[PDB]
Amino acid sequence: ESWQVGRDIIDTARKQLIKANPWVVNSQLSVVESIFLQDATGTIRIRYDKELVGKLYREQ
């Protein structure tokens, strides 16, 4: 039942990305499926994975 941590990480990342960059409001920030956070025009593109997330969580 450990699928309840990636959800929180993804939500937090999306909120921070919207907050820190003042031109995404008119766009439609989405989550396609690796996992990518994309933009309406296809300029912003980030990637996520299981292993790095797990290691960083364990260390923290």
Partner: protein, 61 residues
């Protein structure tokens, strides 16, 4: 004169796809308008309705 204007405009504004491929010293009053209209188009194509319509029937006219 007409040939120079047309060639420069075409090559500088219409050829390079993607927003990270554009290099230019400065932009004028009409370059901004053209860029913003192109941005509107690119936003429109990537949507869901156009993709579903094209997948259903291969009609691009």
């Amino acid at each position: 004169l007409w040939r120079m204007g047309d060639t420069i405009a075409d090559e500088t504004l219409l050829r390079p796809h993607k927003l990270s491929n554009m290099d230019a010293k400065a932009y004028g009053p009409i370059a901004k308008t053209v860029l913003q209209f192109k941005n509107f188009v690119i936003k429109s194509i990537n949507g869901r309705t156009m993709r579903t319509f094209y997948n259903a029937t291969k009609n691009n006219r």
